[PDB]
């Protein structure tokens, strides 16, 4: 069925660098850009939400505030992955991906963040 | 893939009405559906839709008020509901599923439920 | 909002007599739109999907085309049970309907 798959369900990132998040949904031939939809959320936070090709920004948590952005030159190979510029130690915690492209699936990435 | 709406309701001005809807067909809770508003002698208009795993749904700008919708997995139904009814909101009322090969937007309506009439007054 | 212009109103043809149904979109919706036909009392029934391509069950008379802002339905020989209302749908974007086309037999 349709499945959304992550590479990595633990990564290990440390203070003030670069992450990005990996997830892989399935692709035939051509992207349909209009069925995509990716939600990356983490807890109670909203971080990305798309849907149709836009951002809703409105929803989006304070906290990733010009900082969170969706990779979307990896989307039409069927890899929606979120880059957090300048991870805090506020970052860690358990992401979730959720795409719906034909069907939907979610997925669980735990981030830890080692201290300098 | 099939579709079952409730029966039709008539309820008086500034009272609630929700509507009940389920999926006999392919998977539910993976799917969006969407409901649409058919005024009388009107064109039909997107409401709001969601997928049900997702666990929040998407109202148009001119329903975002009254409109709450909500989807239970664990029936295979989903439910629409129209806080503080009046006076012209009396239409038809639909549920509809995207076939899975017409592409485009998720909440596309293509299976229908057999339609819901609402009529408000006095 | 993408808003679908449909034209004209109202069609009134006979039997036997081609039919075209026209569909402007105020933005470029590209090929995403499906025709739907709505009898009096009934839900609407998808009859041409992607713009251009006719589902399973539904006649060989009927037919539709173009991508972008244009598009038109064609119904090649007026069956009398194809006399009804012609609504239209973009999927690019948020889904909006138009106006829809009813089609009146000419007698």
């Known amino acids: 069925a349709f499945t959304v798959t992550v590479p990595k369900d633990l990564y290990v990132v440390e203070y003030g660098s670069n992450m990005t998040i990996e997830c892989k949904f399935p692709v035939e031939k051509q992207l349909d850009l209009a069925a995509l939809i990716v939600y990356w959320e983490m807890e109670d936070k909203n971080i990305i939400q798309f849907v149709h090709g836009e951002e809703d920004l409105k929803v989006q948590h304070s906290s990733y505030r010009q900082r969170a952005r969706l990779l979307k030159d990896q989307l039409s190979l069927g890899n929606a992955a979120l880059q957090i510029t300048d991870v805090k130690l506020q970052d860690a915690g358990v992401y979730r991906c959720m795409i719906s492209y034909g069907g939907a699936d979610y997925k669980r990435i735990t981030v830890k963040v080692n201290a300098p | 893939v099939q579709l079952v709406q409730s029966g039709a309701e008539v309820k008086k001005p500034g009272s609630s009405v929700k509507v009940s809807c389920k999926t006999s067909?392919?998977?539910?809770?993976?799917?969006?559906i969407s409901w649409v508003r058919q005024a009388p002698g009107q064109g039909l208009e997107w409401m709001g839709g969601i997928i049900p795993i997702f666990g929040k749904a998407h109202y148009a700008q001119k329903f975002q008020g009254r409109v709450t919708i909500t989807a239970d997995e664990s029936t295979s139904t989903a439910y629409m509901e129209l806080s503080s009814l009046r006076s012209e909101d009396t239409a038809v009322y639909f549920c509809?599923?995207?076939?899975?090969?017409?592409?485009?937007?998720?909440?596309?309506?293509?299976?229908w439920g057999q339609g819901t009439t609402v009529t408000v007054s006095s | 909002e993408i808003v679908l212009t449909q034209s004209p109103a109202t069609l009134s043809l006979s039997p036997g007599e081609r039919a075209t149904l026209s569909c402007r979109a105020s933005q470029s919706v590209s090929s995403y739109l499906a025709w739907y036909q709505q009898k009096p009392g009934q839900a609407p029934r998808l009859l041409i999907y992607?713009?251009?391509n006719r589902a399973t069950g539904i006649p060989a008379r009927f037919s539709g085309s173009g991508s972008g802002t244009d598009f038109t339905l064609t119904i090649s020989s007026l069956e009398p049970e194809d006399f009804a209302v012609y609504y239209c749908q973009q999927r690019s974007n948020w889904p909006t309907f138009g106006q829809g086309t009813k089609v009146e037999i000419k007698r």
């Open positions: 992607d713009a251009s």
């Open positions: 067909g392919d998977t539910f809770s993976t799917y969006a």
């Open positions: 509809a599923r995207k076939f899975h090969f017409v592409s485009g937007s998720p909440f596309g309506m293509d299976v």
